[PDB]
């Protein structure tokens, strides 16, 4: 009962859609918990000063690149037209 599975594209299938939904959100601005506010300040200020000095464009770009090229389609693009 090892039950190995096999998912292959059906015969006449023209192509294959892969849908998902990714949500970016500003939940990194404030730590979800800090039992010591003294460290919460040095992280919210860390985030603020990061954003001011080196803007979000690098992390945002490196995320949106993985979104916009097929990289979430992990191996399903090795043999794709």
């Amino acid at each position: 009962p090892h039950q190995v599975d096999f998912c292959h594209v059906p015969y006449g299938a023209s192509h294959i859609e892969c849908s998902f939904s990714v949500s970016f959100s500003s939940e990194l601005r404030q730590p979800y918990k800090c039992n010591s506010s003294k460290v919460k300040q040095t992280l919210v200020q860390l985030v603020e000063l990061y954003e001011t000095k080196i803007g979000w464009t690098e992390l945002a770009t490196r995320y949106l690149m993985n979104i916009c090229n097929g990289k979430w389609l992990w191996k399903n693009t090795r043999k794709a037209y």
Partner: protein, 48 residues
């Protein structure tokens, strides 16, 4: 010294390194990029 909790131990240092009017080194902004991405991933940075 390039894990997460090590470069978090130096967050106070990074605050003043950014706060200077001069631009910081490339390696230190790489460290802070990794630190920010590790916050974006979120998680539990605790020691019980």
């Amino acid at each position: 010294g390039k894990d997460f909790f090590s470069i978090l131990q130096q967050a106070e240092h990074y605050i003043e390194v950014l706060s200077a009017n001069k631009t910081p080194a490339q390696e230190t902004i790489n460290d802070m990029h990794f630190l920010m991405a590790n916050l974006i991933k979120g998680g539990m940075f605790q020691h019980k």
